[PDB]
């Protein structure tokens, strides 16, 4: 029970933020009974612990909030589909953040979870590092109006800078697909065919990440809990479409990626009809010279073999017709 | 027949404020979105502002960001621009451009500026 | 913000020609790229959007090509007509940004 699943165990720290319509203040801290009694203030709060593989705070965090071990194994737990849990005291979330590298074409996934509970938000990462820095200059900067609403709020922001983050991925994936697409069109190689089925690979597995968040946000927008508020639905309405948007692009992005390859795969054994062709004539034109460079070659002294005719030029005359016999036998079928 | 006139360009002291209007004709300024395009004396072209009349949403560049402000009259067809705080390096030809957006993907759109006024002259 | 270098910044070239001016983003504009044309003294004029579509009435002797980043518009021949200043535009984000200019001059 409360055992760690994901590979991050690299560091810990806790970055807590606390905003009103006047005052403001965040201080990161590394002790978990500090950031304990938040949850009574009326002022929205923002817990984020950055590294759950100390279970000991996330066990405490939930005992001290009152929330069940389940949703605290689900923390834990990193294979698992996005998905949203509605209760009577707090509302679970689970999402997927995602990185792409423009050197090496890999994407890497992170479980972030959600949870809201009167105006505190709670959010469980897994190692340093995030897409919700534009939330954060937004409440330390004096802009928008996230210090004038609750944590339902928040928990708006912090989705709309997840989804940013995936528009922003469907930007690097658009110009590699048309890297991609000019190489395959003049390039064609075995390091692009493994780079199209990795590319394949990557879209699929966004796809399959992108299902489940769509549901979220429809859960979000239309189930509307008493404790999410009517006020903030339109915004939920709103990403809900931003989702819509982006499955609709890894859609066209798939069609596209896996319609690449086929008529370079198609085309092989062409080449090979090449090679023949270059084999064959070599073939055909040089060995009945040396055959019967070998058959007057003979060492027995006994040929017709005296000065008479000059051998040497007669030989090589016979080698030039041969050699143009064959080449005008051949190209009759557009051969070369 | 489509025709964009600006107008309130001239000589203005420095830290003071200047307001350009842009008549549209031909159009209605709450189907498109309306630019202000700057360039400066012997130097190339820069947007500063945008405005969507339907929405009322505004975007200003960097450079005249809380000093200038954008905005649109649906019932003159009329376009604005407050400038305030101006300075020795805000003289330049002040345009105002229509543009429409096309599609590109699912997620990305980008728009063109079809048509400019003649431009003003502001120092 | 994006930064859209223009690259050169002059080009000299007589008429019938092939003339090309590439142009790099920082970072990623999807397709987002259009091309105006000022001669000196007047307005600018729409050439190509979404880096390969030619706006109507233009003639078809300009063109525009995107390969990932770089952006690239092509003469295929040129004209007494084609001498200007050619700039370079992103509309990916909200916040519009120019290229510096390429004149074509004799």
């Known amino acids: 029970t409360l055992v760690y699943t994901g590979k991050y165990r690299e560091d810990f720290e806790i970055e807590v933020m606390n905003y009103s319509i006047e005052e403001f203040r965040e201080f990161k801290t590394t002790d978990v009974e500090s950031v304990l009694p938040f949850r009574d203030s009326s002022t929205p709060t923002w817990i984020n612990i950055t590294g759950i593989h100390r279970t000991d705070v996330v066990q405490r965090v939930g005992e001290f909030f009152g929330i069940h071990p389940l949703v605290l194994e689900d923390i834990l737990n990193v294979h698992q589909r996005p998905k949203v849990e509605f209760f009577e005291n707090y509302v679970f979330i689970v999402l997927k953040m995602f990185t792409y590298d423009k050197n090496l074409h890999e994407l890497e996934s992170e479980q972030v979870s959600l949870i809201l509970t009167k105006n505190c938000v709670l959010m469980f990462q897994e190692k340093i590092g995030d897409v919700f820095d534009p939330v954060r200059e937004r409440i330390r900067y004096n802009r928008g109006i996230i210090r004038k609403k609750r944590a339902d709020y928040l928990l708006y922001s912090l989705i709309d800078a997840l989804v940013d983050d995936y528009f922003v991925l469907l930007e690097k994936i658009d110009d590699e697909i048309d890297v991609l697409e000019e190489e395959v069109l003049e390039r064609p190689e075995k390091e692009t065919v493994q780079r199209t089925h990795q590319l394949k690979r990557n879209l699929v597995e966004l796809r399959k990440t992108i299902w489940p968040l769509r549901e979220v946000l429809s859960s979000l927008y239309r189930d509307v809990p008493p404790l999410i508020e009517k006020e903030t639905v339109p915004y939920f309405r709103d990403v809900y479409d931003h989702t819509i948007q982006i499955a609709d692009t890894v859609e066209t992005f798939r069609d596209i990626v896996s319609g690449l390859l086929d008529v370079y795969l198609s085309s092989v054994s062409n080449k090979t009809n090449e090679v023949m062709k270059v084999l064959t004539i070599i073939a055909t034109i040089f060995m009945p010279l040396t055959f019967i460079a070998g058959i007057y070659g003979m060492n027995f002294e006994y040929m017709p073999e005296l000065r008479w005719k000059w051998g040497y030029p007669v030989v090589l005359a016979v080698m030039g017709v041969i050699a143009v016999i064959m080449v005008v036998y051949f190209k009759k079928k557009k051969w070369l | 027949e489509v025709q964009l006139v600006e107008s309130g360009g001239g000589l203005v002291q420095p830290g003071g404020s200047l307001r350009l209007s842009c008549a549209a004709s031909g159009f209605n300024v709450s189907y498109y979105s309306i630019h202000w395009v700057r360039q400066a004396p012997g130097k190339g072209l820069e947007w500063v502002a945008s405005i969507s009349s339907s929405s009322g949403s505004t975007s200003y560049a960097d450079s005249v960001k809380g000093r200038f402000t954008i905005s649109a009259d649906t019932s003159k067809n009329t376009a604005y621009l407050q400038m305030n705080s101006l300075r020795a390096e805000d003289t330049a030809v002040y345009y105002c451009?229509?543009?429409?957006?096309?599609?590109?993907?699912?997620?990305?759109?980008?728009?063109?500026?079809?048509?400019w006024g003649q431009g003003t002259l502001v120092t | 913000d994006i930064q859209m270098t223009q690259s050169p910044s002059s080009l000299s070239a007589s008429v019938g020609d092939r003339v090309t001016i590439t142009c790099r983003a920082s970072?990623?504009?999807?397709?987002?790229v259009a091309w105006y044309q000022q001669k000196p003294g007047k307005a600018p004029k729409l050439l190509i959007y979404?880096?390969?579509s030619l706006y109507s009435g233009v003639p078809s002797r300009f063109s525009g090509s995107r390969s990932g980043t770089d952006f690239t518009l092509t003469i295929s021949s040129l004209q007494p007509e084609d001498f200007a200043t050619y700039y370079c535009?992103?509309?990916?984000?909200?916040?519009?940004?120019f290229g510096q200019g390429t004149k074509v001059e004799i």
């Open positions: 979404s880096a390969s």
């Open positions: 535009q992103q509309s990916s984000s909200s916040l519009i940004t």
């Open positions: 451009a229509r543009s429409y957006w096309y599609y590109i993907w699912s997620y990305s759109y980008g728009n063109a500026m079809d048509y």
């Open positions: 970072q990623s504009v999807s397709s987002a």
